[PDB]
C-alpha cells in the first residue's frame, strides 16, 4: 500500500510505567504496563510515503484485545476481551492523518503470561480494511495485583521413612509475594541413616489443558543444595532475584500456573524421597 507505517502513541507516553516480559527466545521485550480498569488512550498516526496518493479503504479500525492462545499452533485462540473503535468509515485517504482513540475503563482480568504451552496477551490492533486488510499490533502488558496480611502460617512438610529416618522442613507462610523471602528451617529429627543428598527446589507447573485433554510443563525456578552429604539448617529463599509470576488458577479454564516447594532427599541406599507442597504467589502493589 501507500502507507510508510502505522504508529500507535499512548497519551501517557513518557510518564507511564513499563514492564519487561521474556520472549520465547529469552530476549527481554519492554512494553507499557496497565492494570484492570485503567483507560487506554492515545493517537494512531498513519503516514503516507507520498502525499496526494489516493488510498481507497473499506474502513479503519483500532481494537483492544485480551487474547488466550493455547497450544502454539492455531486456532484454539479466543478473545476474552474485545473493544472496537472505528477511526474512519469506508472512504479514502490522500494525506497523513492522526486519529484519536480512547477506551474508557478496560477490563483486564488476567495478568499477561508468556508460556511454553500457552500465551495470554493484550494488544492494541490497528486494522485497515481493504479489498487482505493491513494490520498493526501494539503490545501491552497487564499485571494482576493483590494484597495479603503479613502473618506466619508456619507450614511444614516432612520426608519420613518411619523410625529410622525423619526430616522436617518448616517455612513461615503458604502465600508469598513476588519480592518476598521464604523463611525456613530444616530439622533433622531423626537420622538412623546417612543422607547422600538433600535438595530444596522451587518449581512452577503450567497446566495447559481443556477438559480431559491436559498437559503439564514443569520448570525449576530454584535449587537449594542443602547437602552434598553427609553430616538444624536455616533456609532463606529470596524470591526477588528470580522472575516468578503470580499464581494463576483456572484462567478461563484454559490454563493454570502454580508454584510448589519440593523437598528432595537421597539416602545412603540411593533411594529417593519426595515431598511437594503448593505455595501461592501474588504481586504486591508498587505504591
Amino acid at each position: 500500500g501507500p502507507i510508510c507505517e502505522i504508529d500507535v502513541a499512548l497519551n501517557d507516553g513518557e510518564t507511564r510505567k513499563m514492564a519487561e516480559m521474556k520472549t520465547e527466545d529469552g530476549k527481554v521485550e519492554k512494553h507499557y504496563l496497565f492494570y484492570d480498569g485503567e483507560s487506554v488512550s492515545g493517537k494512531v498516526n498513519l503516514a503516507f510515503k507520498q502525499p496526494g496518493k489516493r488510498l481507497e479503504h473499506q474502513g479503519i479500525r483500532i481494537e483492544f484485545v485480551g487474547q488466550i492462545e493455547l497450544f502454539n499452533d492455531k486456532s484454539n485462540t479466543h478473545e476474552f476481551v474485545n473493544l472496537v473503535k472505528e477511526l474512519a468509515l469506508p472512504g479514502e485517504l490522500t494525506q497523513s492523518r492522526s486519529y484519536d482513540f480512547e477506551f474508557m475503563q478496560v477490563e483486564k482480568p488476567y495478568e499477561s503470561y508468556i508460556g511454553a504451552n500457552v500465551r495470554l496477551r493484550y494488544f492494541l490492533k490497528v486494522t485497515i480494511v481493504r479489498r487482505t486488510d493491513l494490520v498493526k499490533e501494539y503490545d501491552l502488558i497487564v499485571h494482576q495485583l493483590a494484597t495479603y496480611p503479613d502473618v506466619n502460617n508456619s507450614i511444614k512438610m516432612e520426608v519420613g521413612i518411619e523410625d529410622c529416618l525423619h526430616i522436617e522442613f518448616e517455612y513461615n507462610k503458604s502465600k508469598y509475594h513476588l519480592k518476598d523471602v521464604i523463611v525456613g528451617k530444616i530439622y533433622f529429627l531423626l537420622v538412623r541413616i546417612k543422607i547422600q543428598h538433600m535438595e530444596l527446589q522451587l518449581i512452577k507447573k503450567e497446566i495447559t489443558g481443556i477438559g480431559p485433554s491436559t498437559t503439564t510443563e514443569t520448570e525449576t525456578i530454584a535449587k537449594y543444595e542443602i547437602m552434598d552429604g553427609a553430616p538444624s539448617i536455616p533456609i532463606r529463599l529470596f524470591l526477588a532475584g528470580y522472575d516468578p509470576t503470580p499464581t494463576m488458577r483456572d484462567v478461563n479454564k484454559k490454563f493454570s500456573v502454580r508454584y510448589f516447594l519440593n523437598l528432595v532427599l537421597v539416602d545412603e541406599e540411593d533411594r529417593r524421597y519426595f515431598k511437594q507442597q503448593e505455595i501461592i504467589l501474588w504481586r504486591k502493589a508498587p505504591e
Partner: protein
C-alpha cells in the same frame, strides 16, 4: 459505582440491611470505576421502608468503609462485627452497582 456516603439512623430493631461476602482476608485488586480495590463486602438485602432504605442504601452496594474505617479485604465477620458496634447512627461509604 462512584463512592458515596450513607447515614443510617438506627430505627427500632435494625439498620435494616444485610451483608454478604468473602470469608477470607485480602484478595485480588480489581477495578470498580477504574479504581482498584481489594475485595469488598456488599449489601445483600435492604428491608423496604427500613432505616437503610430511607438512608438510600441500595441492594448490591459494596462497602468501602464503616464509620470512616476502610474495610477493603476484610472478612465477613470483621465487617458484620463492626456494623454491630450498636451505635445509633451508622455511616457507610459505599460503591454502588
Amino acid at each position: 459505582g462512584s463512592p458515596r456516603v450513607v447515614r443510617i439512623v438506627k430505627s427500632e430493631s435494625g439498620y435494616g440491611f444485610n451483608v454478604r461476602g468473602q470469608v477470607s482476608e485480602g484478595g485480588q485488586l480489581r477495578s470498580i470505576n477504574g479504581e482498584l480495590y481489594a475485595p469488598l463486602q456488599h449489601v445483600s438485602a435492604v428491608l423496604p421502608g427500613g432505616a437503610a432504605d430511607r438512608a438510600g442504601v441500595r441492594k448490591g452496594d459494596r462497602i468501602l468503609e464503616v464509620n470512616g474505617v476502610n474495610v477493603e479485604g476484610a472478612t465477613h465477620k470483621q465487617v458484620v462485627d463492626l456494623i454491630r458496634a450498636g451505635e445509633k447512627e451508622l455511616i457507610l461509604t459505599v460503591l454502588s452497582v
